[PDB]
Amino acid sequence: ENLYFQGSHVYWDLDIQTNAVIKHRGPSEVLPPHPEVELLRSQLILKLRQHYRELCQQREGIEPPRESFNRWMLERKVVDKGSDPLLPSNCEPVVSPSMFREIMNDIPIRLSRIKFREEAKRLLFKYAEAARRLIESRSASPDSRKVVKWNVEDTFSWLRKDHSASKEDYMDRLEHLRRQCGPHVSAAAKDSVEGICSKIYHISLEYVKRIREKHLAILKENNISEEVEAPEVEPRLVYCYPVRLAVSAPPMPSVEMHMENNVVCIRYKGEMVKVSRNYFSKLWLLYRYSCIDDSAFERFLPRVWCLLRRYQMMFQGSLPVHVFEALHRLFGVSFECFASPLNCYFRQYCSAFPDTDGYFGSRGPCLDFAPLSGSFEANPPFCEELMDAMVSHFERLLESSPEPLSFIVFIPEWREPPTPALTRMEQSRFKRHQLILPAFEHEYRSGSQHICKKEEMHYKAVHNTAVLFLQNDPGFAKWAPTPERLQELSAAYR
Numbered sequence: 001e002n003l004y005f006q007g008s009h010v011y012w013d014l015d016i017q018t019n020a021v022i023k024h025r026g027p028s029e030v031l032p033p034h035p036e037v038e039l040l041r042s043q044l045i046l047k048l049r050q051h052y053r054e055l056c057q058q059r060e061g062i063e064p065p066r067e068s069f070n071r072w073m074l075e076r077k078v079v080d081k082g083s084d085p086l087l088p089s090n091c092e093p094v095v096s097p098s099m100f101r102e103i104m105n106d107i108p109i110r111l112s113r114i115k116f117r118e119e120a121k122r123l124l125f126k127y128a129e130a131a132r133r134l135i136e137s138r139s140a141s142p143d144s145r146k147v148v149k150w151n152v153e154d155t156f157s158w159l160r161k162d163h164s165a166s167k168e169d170y171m172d173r174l175e176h177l178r179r180q181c182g183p184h185v186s187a188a189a190k191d192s193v194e195g196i197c198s199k200i201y202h203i204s205l206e207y208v209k210r211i212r213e214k215h216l217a218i219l220k221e222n223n224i225s226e227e228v229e230a231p232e233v234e235p236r237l238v239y240c241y242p243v244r245l246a247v248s249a250p251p252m253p254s255v256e257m258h259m260e261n262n263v264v265c266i267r268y269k270g271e272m273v274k275v276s277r278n279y280f281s282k283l284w285l286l287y288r289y290s291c292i293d294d295s296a297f298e299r300f301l302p303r304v305w306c307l308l309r310r311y312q313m314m315f316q317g318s319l320p321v322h323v324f325e326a327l328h329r330l331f332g333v334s335f336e337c338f339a340s341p342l343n344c345y346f347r348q349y350c351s352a353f354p355d356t357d358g359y360f361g362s363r364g365p366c367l368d369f370a371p372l373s374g375s376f377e378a379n380p381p382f383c384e385e386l387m388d389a390m391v392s393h394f395e396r397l398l399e400s401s402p403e404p405l406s407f408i409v410f411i412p413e414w415r416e417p418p419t420p421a422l423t424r425m426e427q428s429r430f431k432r433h434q435l436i437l438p439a440f441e442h443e444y445r446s447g448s449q450h451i452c453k454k455e456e457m458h459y460k461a462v463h464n465t466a467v468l469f470l471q472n473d474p475g476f477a478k479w480a481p482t483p484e485r486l487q488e489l490s491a492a493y494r
């Protein structure tokens, strides 16, 4: 009963070797990270977030929906053909469907939960006033104007007369009025919201070039060229390896590091990133297991600074440790399709950034990773466009491979009407079993687990979680969801 230090718990098993198999692929075209480039990349995101909250206020009088910007970057990266690993650069369509609908949901007014009878009367009144105002101001068909005008006016006549209404009466009147005016207000504000989604995209596209022009200037300063070395590959099937970068890495600037109360602090030009001690030791193991261009491991500290700085600009949680042990012991799981160097359980995984995370075991973005065999676990971030692309990606891999392939996907029943991605997997021909983790009866690890305290690690899931076993025929023959296996799996959730 004597820990090495306070918080010296292990939340990973970096000894599990991979069973993921891929065709040997060439290096990624993304440039190796550099602290001077990430410093410019971080301050351009902070400007981009400020542009986003100025456009929503100046053009709609509303603040941006919470996490709508972060969700926007996930959606953009599903279709982005650009070369920046964080900001979108070449997307189709320009207007993001994710950012568009999240803004529309708070138009003409962001509805808030009401805790009193007069609060409901206020929200109903404020909505009616905002809906009528938005139609008169923005160009619309005289028909659409008249429908909103009268339907709003009817709500006002009822508010003056019927003073005996209750908290429930005001709520039902709002939903009806929201149903009637909803479609008409959307067409009037469509051009305005599309402008917000388009302006933010074009500003980011401009920021990407400002990042590349400084990144190329640093490479040319160190006499490094952006050319191919030897794309001649002997085509073969191999076990998965960390994503490699084509361009050689230049020598990194010096960074200063100190530890205070088992918390590691790394500094570069006044900017400091923090990480707890055991996760700092974890990154050291991942760096030794994965990095092959740093012979003396001399770029470790500056590359860790870039890693932590990248996930700071990025601003769910992980499965419990005892659950990952069960997935590996019962279903041979050895790979996380959605993870990061800070939350990964295995030393092989897919992450959002191949330039900063490849040095720590990442295989790059999941949609660019095409395994032909292996047992996988999938806990993707809540983003419908990414989730939908995921099951399409998984189904293609299960279709076109005679080797054992398995995907155990954890998706919450968060939304009152389920995401199409969850429904698509429920009807998949590779679905071998569907399991439901009851709400308030299973846990997750913190999303800030890399620096949060041990008392703040685990939290109860307030929603159900759907666990789906997507396996081809040979994968089902090897890692079948047998009753005895499903028995021990649910035993780890207790």
Ligand SMILES: Nc1ncnc2c1ncn2[C@@H]1O[C@H](CSCC[C@H](N)C(=O)O)[C@@H](O)[C@H]1O
Residues within 6 Å of the ligand: 074, 077, 316, 317, 318, 319, 336, 337, 338, 339, 340, 343, 344, 345, 350, 351, 352, 364, 365, 366, 367, 377, 378, 379, 380, 381
């Ligand atoms: N395009 C992408 N490909 C792979 N992983 C991605 C990704 N975009 C985001 N992610 C990562 O997916 C993670 C989802 S949280 C998952 C936690 C844990 N690895 C688990 O499986 O339970 C986030 O940390 C995020 O960084």
